Ligand binder design. Structure first.
Ligand SMILES: Cc1ccc2cc(C(=O)O)[nH]c2c1
Length: 168
């Protein structure tokens, strides 16, 4: 469990790797994988779609049941559902979608949810279609998360920009 390999330590508690978060979950067997969720837990693309596809749609079926029963999440909020074949748990975290006019200050609230778990495999939040600057998202992660977070960044050019941003 939690067999993280080849990470670069950026701070006392934040680590980073140029890797596919699905292949990392399969290798590492983490206690927790973080999903970059939306408030209706509709896993239609990006990390959410990739994680759901790796679970053979189990995650979407679970999530549909959760939302029908319990209603939508709030921006900045989270829920813990099954990790299926990827992890013990999936922490579904909703970062703000600034492309849709949501407030970037809620990225802090989103990352604060990581402090309820000793160690996490995670993507950067509010990246991709959510429209935040990835360098800013890494900074909020570093400033907010105090538990151990292993970040997986798929794109090499972005990984390099993030690491360079951070150590040069
Ligand atoms: C699929 C999977 C991956 C990691 C873990 C870790 C646990 C545990 O601590 O009980 N269960 C898992 C299941």
């Amino acid at each position: 469990v939690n067999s993280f390999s080849g990470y670069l330590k950026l701070t006392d508690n934040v680590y980073i790797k140029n890797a596919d978060i699905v292949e990392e979950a399969k290798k590492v067997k983490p206690t927790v994988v973080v999903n970059a969720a939306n408030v209706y837990l509709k896993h239609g693309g990006g990390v959410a779609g990739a994680l759901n596809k790796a679970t053979n749609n189990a995650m979407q079926v679970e999530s549909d049941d959760y939302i029908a029963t319990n209603g939508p999440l709030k921006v900045g909020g989270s829920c813990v559902l099954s990790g299926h074949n990827l992890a013990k748990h999936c922490l579904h975290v909703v970062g703000p979608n600034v492309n849709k006019g949501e407030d970037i200050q809620l990225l802090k609230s989103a990352y604060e949810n990581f402090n309820q778990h000793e160690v996490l495999l995670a993507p950067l939040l509010s990246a991709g279609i959510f429209g935040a600057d990835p360098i800013h998202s890494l900074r909020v992660c570093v400033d907010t998360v105090r538990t151990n977070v292993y970040l997986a960044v798929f794109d090499k050019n972005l990984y390099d920009k993030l690491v360079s941003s951070f150590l040069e």
